[PDB]
PDB file of C-alpha atoms in Angstrom:
ATOM      1  CA  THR U   1      -2.715  14.488 -31.980  1.00 11.56           C
ATOM      2  CA  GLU U   2      -0.537  15.690 -29.140  1.00 10.79           C
ATOM      3  CA  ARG U   3      -1.930  16.896 -25.993  1.00 11.12           C
ATOM      4  CA  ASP U   4      -0.882  20.564 -23.780  1.00  9.62           C
ATOM      5  CA  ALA U   5      -0.172  20.032 -20.542  1.00 10.29           C
ATOM      6  CA  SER U   6      -3.723  21.295 -19.075  1.00 12.68           C
ATOM      7  CA  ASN U   7      -2.655  21.031 -15.422  1.00 11.43           C
ATOM      8  CA  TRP U   8       0.775  23.195 -15.732  1.00 12.66           C
ATOM      9  CA  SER U   9      -1.067  26.255 -17.272  1.00 12.00           C
ATOM     10  CA  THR U  10      -4.285  26.508 -14.718  1.00 12.98           C
ATOM     11  CA  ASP U  11      -1.692  25.580 -11.877  1.00 15.77           C
ATOM     12  CA  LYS U  12       0.552  29.395 -13.390  1.00 10.52           C
ATOM     13  CA  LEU U  13      -2.062  30.779 -15.444  1.00 10.59           C
ATOM     14  CA  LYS U  14      -4.330  30.714 -11.846  1.00 11.00           C
ATOM     15  CA  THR U  15      -1.481  31.895  -9.514  1.00 10.47           C
ATOM     16  CA  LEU U  16       0.258  34.160 -11.799  1.00  6.22           C
ATOM     17  CA  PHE U  17      -3.469  35.992 -12.377  1.00  7.82           C
ATOM     18  CA  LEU U  18      -4.078  35.912  -8.770  1.00  7.38           C
ATOM     19  CA  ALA U  19      -0.372  37.085  -8.390  1.00  6.74           C
ATOM     20  CA  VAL U  20      -1.826  41.060 -10.449  1.00  6.60           C
ATOM     21  CA  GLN U  21       0.154  44.021  -8.802  1.00  5.81           C
ATOM     22  CA  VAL U  22      -0.667  46.516  -7.844  1.00  3.86           C
ATOM     23  CA  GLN U  23       1.501  49.771  -8.135  1.00  2.28           C
ATOM     24  CA  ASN U  24       0.548  52.738  -7.386  1.00  3.46           C
ATOM     25  CA  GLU U  25      -2.963  54.114  -5.697  1.00  3.66           C
ATOM     26  CA  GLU U  26      -3.512  55.906  -8.432  1.00  6.20           C
ATOM     27  CA  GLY U  27      -3.396  53.185 -10.130  1.00  9.62           C
ATOM     28  CA  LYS U  28      -3.680  50.210  -8.379  1.00  7.14           C
ATOM     29  CA  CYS U  29      -4.562  46.589  -8.505  1.00  7.48           C
ATOM     30  CA  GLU U  30      -5.047  43.632  -6.348  1.00  8.69           C
ATOM     31  CA  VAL U  31      -7.225  40.173  -7.271  1.00 10.08           C
ATOM     32  CA  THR U  32      -9.583  38.819  -5.575  1.00  7.49           C
ATOM     33  CA  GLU U  33      -9.866  35.629  -6.982  1.00  6.55           C
ATOM     34  CA  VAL U  34      -9.054  33.514 -10.401  1.00  8.17           C
ATOM     35  CA  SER U  35     -10.897  30.698 -12.413  1.00  6.74           C
ATOM     36  CA  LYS U  36      -8.955  28.879 -14.656  1.00  7.40           C
ATOM     37  CA  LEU U  37      -8.789  27.768 -18.526  1.00  3.71           C
ATOM     38  CA  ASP U  38     -11.525  26.086 -18.148  1.00  3.32           C
ATOM     39  CA  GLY U  39     -12.495  23.681 -21.315  1.00  2.00           C
ATOM     40  CA  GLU U  40      -9.630  21.856 -23.994  1.00  2.00           C
ATOM     41  CA  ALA U  41      -5.958  22.669 -25.424  1.00  2.63           C
ATOM     42  CA  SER U  42      -4.114  20.662 -27.741  1.00  3.18           C
ATOM     43  CA  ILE U  43      -0.587  21.518 -29.118  1.00  5.29           C
ATOM     44  CA  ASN U  44       0.695  18.970 -31.773  1.00  7.57           C
ATOM     45  CA  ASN U  45       3.284  16.693 -31.757  1.00  8.95           C
ATOM     46  CA  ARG U  46       6.561  18.062 -30.449  1.00  7.25           C
ATOM     47  CA  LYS U  47      10.030  17.537 -31.546  1.00  7.70           C
ATOM     48  CA  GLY U  48       9.606  20.516 -33.538  1.00  8.24           C
ATOM     49  CA  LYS U  49       6.932  19.824 -34.382  1.00 10.52           C
ATOM     50  CA  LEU U  50       5.356  22.300 -31.845  1.00 12.99           C
ATOM     51  CA  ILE U  51       1.974  24.501 -31.937  1.00 16.27           C
ATOM     52  CA  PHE U  52       0.100  25.825 -29.648  1.00 16.04           C
ATOM     53  CA  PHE U  53      -3.714  25.539 -30.612  1.00 17.50           C
ATOM     54  CA  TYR U  54      -5.242  25.638 -27.710  1.00 16.15           C
ATOM     55  CA  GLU U  55      -9.333  26.014 -27.038  1.00 14.24           C
ATOM     56  CA  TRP U  56     -10.556  26.911 -24.221  1.00 13.49           C
ATOM     57  CA  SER U  57     -12.503  30.387 -22.206  1.00 15.44           C
ATOM     58  CA  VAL U  58     -11.269  31.897 -18.687  1.00 17.52           C
ATOM     59  CA  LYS U  59     -13.178  33.576 -15.689  1.00 15.08           C
ATOM     60  CA  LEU U  60     -11.428  35.313 -13.995  1.00 17.52           C
ATOM     61  CA  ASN U  61     -12.105  39.182 -11.008  1.00 16.66           C
ATOM     62  CA  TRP U  62      -9.400  41.692  -9.834  1.00 16.90           C
ATOM     63  CA  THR U  63      -9.489  44.574  -7.778  1.00 19.73           C
ATOM     64  CA  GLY U  64      -8.218  48.155  -7.886  1.00 20.42           C
ATOM     65  CA  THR U  65      -8.686  51.191  -6.315  1.00 20.52           C
ATOM     66  CA  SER U  66      -7.793  55.316  -7.610  1.00 21.21           C
ATOM     67  CA  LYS U  67      -5.886  58.286  -6.549  1.00 23.46           C
ATOM     68  CA  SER U  68     -10.291  59.162  -5.917  1.00 20.61           C
ATOM     69  CA  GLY U  69     -10.609  56.841  -3.152  1.00 23.40           C
ATOM     70  CA  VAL U  70     -12.551  54.075  -4.462  1.00 22.06           C
ATOM     71  CA  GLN U  71     -12.215  50.387  -4.910  1.00 24.55           C
ATOM     72  CA  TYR U  72     -13.802  49.493  -8.158  1.00 22.64           C
ATOM     73  CA  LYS U  73     -14.137  45.095  -8.684  1.00 23.60           C
ATOM     74  CA  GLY U  74     -14.285  44.425 -12.454  1.00 22.77           C
ATOM     75  CA  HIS U  75     -14.203  41.132 -14.743  1.00 22.90           C
ATOM     76  CA  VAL U  76     -12.041  39.670 -16.934  1.00 22.20           C
ATOM     77  CA  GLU U  77     -12.797  36.251 -19.425  1.00 22.11           C
ATOM     78  CA  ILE U  78     -11.108  35.608 -22.351  1.00 19.42           C
ATOM     79  CA  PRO U  79     -13.266  33.013 -24.028  1.00 21.13           C
ATOM     80  CA  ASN U  80     -12.472  29.989 -26.091  1.00 17.99           C
ATOM     81  CA  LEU U  81      -9.005  32.157 -27.759  1.00 21.39           C
ATOM     82  CA  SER U  82      -6.647  29.530 -28.443  1.00 24.65           C
ATOM     83  CA  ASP U  83      -3.297  30.680 -27.049  1.00 24.65           C
ATOM     84  CA  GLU U  84      -1.738  30.513 -30.478  1.00 24.93           C
ATOM     85  CA  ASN U  85      -1.239  33.980 -30.431  1.00 24.05           C
ATOM     86  CA  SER U  86       0.084  36.340 -28.001  1.00 23.16           C
ATOM     87  CA  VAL U  87      -2.327  36.706 -25.349  1.00 21.16           C
ATOM     88  CA  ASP U  88      -1.834  40.214 -24.818  1.00 22.50           C
ATOM     89  CA  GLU U  89      -3.438  40.514 -28.218  1.00 21.48           C
ATOM     90  CA  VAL U  90      -6.265  38.564 -27.453  1.00 24.49           C
ATOM     91  CA  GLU U  91      -9.922  39.011 -26.622  1.00 24.56           C
ATOM     92  CA  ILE U  92     -10.175  40.176 -23.251  1.00 26.55           C
ATOM     93  CA  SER U  93     -13.790  40.818 -21.052  1.00 25.93           C
ATOM     94  CA  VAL U  94     -12.789  43.740 -19.825  1.00 27.83           C
ATOM     95  CA  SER U  95     -14.789  45.468 -17.268  1.00 27.43           C
ATOM     96  CA  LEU U  96     -13.067  48.051 -15.419  1.00 30.33           C
ATOM     97  CA  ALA U  97     -13.774  51.503 -14.116  1.00 26.38           C
ATOM     98  CA  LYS U  98     -16.661  51.469 -16.514  1.00 25.91           C
ATOM     99  CA  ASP U  99     -18.355  51.046 -13.172  1.00 24.73           C
ATOM    100  CA  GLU U 100     -15.807  53.905 -11.037  1.00 25.74           C
ATOM    101  CA  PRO U 101     -14.045  56.999 -11.373  1.00 30.30           C
ATOM    102  CA  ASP U 102     -11.323  55.630 -12.577  1.00 33.43           C
ATOM    103  CA  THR U 103     -10.754  55.485 -15.621  1.00 30.00           C
ATOM    104  CA  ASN U 104      -6.911  56.139 -16.296  1.00 31.99           C
ATOM    105  CA  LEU U 105      -6.615  53.114 -14.381  1.00 33.20           C
ATOM    106  CA  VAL U 106      -8.594  50.610 -16.347  1.00 28.88           C
ATOM    107  CA  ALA U 107      -6.181  52.164 -18.945  1.00 29.52           C
ATOM    108  CA  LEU U 108      -2.881  51.166 -17.182  1.00 30.94           C
ATOM    109  CA  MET U 109      -4.203  47.656 -16.007  1.00 29.85           C
ATOM    110  CA  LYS U 110      -4.733  47.686 -20.595  1.00 30.51           C
ATOM    111  CA  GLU U 111      -0.538  47.243 -20.385  1.00 31.08           C
ATOM    112  CA  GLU U 112      -0.501  45.710 -17.406  1.00 30.10           C
ATOM    113  CA  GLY U 113      -2.892  43.703 -15.832  1.00 29.61           C
ATOM    114  CA  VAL U 114      -4.334  42.176 -20.138  1.00 34.95           C
ATOM    115  CA  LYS U 115      -0.088  42.536 -20.385  1.00 30.80           C
ATOM    116  CA  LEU U 116       0.460  40.974 -16.927  1.00 25.51           C
ATOM    117  CA  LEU U 117      -1.466  37.622 -19.227  1.00 26.94           C
ATOM    118  CA  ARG U 118       0.991  38.083 -21.620  1.00 25.93           C
ATOM    119  CA  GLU U 119       3.699  36.723 -19.143  1.00 28.19           C
ATOM    120  CA  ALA U 120       1.046  33.805 -18.508  1.00 29.95           C
ATOM    121  CA  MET U 121       1.653  33.121 -22.341  1.00 29.89           C
ATOM    122  CA  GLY U 122       5.454  34.162 -20.675  1.00 28.55           C
ATOM    123  CA  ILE U 123       5.258  29.984 -19.117  1.00 26.75           C
ATOM    124  CA  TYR U 124       1.867  28.660 -21.070  1.00 24.35           C
ATOM    125  CA  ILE U 125       4.264  28.785 -24.515  1.00 23.37           C
ATOM    126  CA  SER U 126       7.465  27.840 -22.030  1.00 24.19           C
ATOM    127  CA  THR U 127       6.319  25.804 -19.180  1.00 24.11           C
ATOM    128  CA  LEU U 128       4.296  23.811 -21.334  1.00 25.45           C
ATOM    129  CA  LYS U 129       5.804  22.649 -24.324  1.00 28.95           C
ATOM    130  CA  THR U 130       9.418  23.159 -23.413  1.00 29.06           C
ATOM    131  CA  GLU U 131       7.837  20.601 -20.883  1.00 30.44           C
ATOM    132  CA  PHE U 132       5.890  18.449 -23.447  1.00 32.57           C
ATOM    133  CA  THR U 133       8.576  18.840 -26.580  1.00 31.54           C
ATOM    134  CA  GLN U 134      11.711  18.410 -23.147  1.00 30.50           C
ATOM    135  CA  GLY U 135      12.688  21.175 -25.407  1.00 29.22           C
TER     136      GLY U 135
END
């Protein structure tokens, strides 16, 4: 039973989450605050037996402006989903534009925002495992 570097993740995932970038006012995005994956993450033996099964949920929020001239702050929350799979293909609770006239934007955020989270897998998998098994 090996532990996963959880502290390494929050630090990056949270920041990376506060790193949500914006594009055109037509399809822009801006982070407003990130909680962090709260729960228990764990990896199996390392040195070639290293696998990533985590059980935690993260809660964050964002803000995006639409060419329409409206700002909207949606919700993004992924429950106890394990990164044993693609973070992006994971189950995320997205709630943006549904209340505002961005609609088209939330879609892009689907390929950019939840995608950015794809990057979260980039560090979680790389930073944690590369460090734990030390390569």
